[PDB]
Amino acid sequence: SMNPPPPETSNPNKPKRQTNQLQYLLRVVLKTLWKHQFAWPFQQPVDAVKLNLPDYYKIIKTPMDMGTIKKRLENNYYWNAQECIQDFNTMFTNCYIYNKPGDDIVLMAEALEKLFLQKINELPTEE
């Protein structure tokens, strides 16, 4: 079995900025979710080899995880907040697509997503 290459966290061809909204996404949003008791399945790319999920990357064609997001924020990969928000939403959606309703992992994603929505609700206005 083989994992795909992880999502890009570095790309000199891609435009980027440092902004207060992206700062908030790191300092408030990412940090809040990262420390949660249920964060651990979402802190790195799904290792379909070690986890014995050979169909994972047949079903999930746009993988995303908070490890990748954390790196993208820290390494200034993004142009705007929407790109980062999209990554979070992709991660949650992937979880719900792959896993069965009522699985623990779905409940775990839900707990993180609740907090995500609470924090994004107060995304600051652009400076």
Ligand SMILES: CNC(=O)c1ccc(-n2nc(Cn3cccn3)nc2-c2cn(C)c(=O)c3ccccc23)cc1
């Ligand atoms: C973003 N990541 C995922 O989407 C993900 C990651 C791991 C798992 N795998 N892989 C195993 C190992 N295995 C293979 C065959 C039998 N067992 N078991 C789980 C797992 C299943 N279920 C129902 C859960 O609720 C759950 C909650 C937290 C962590 C793992 C799980 C499922 C989804």
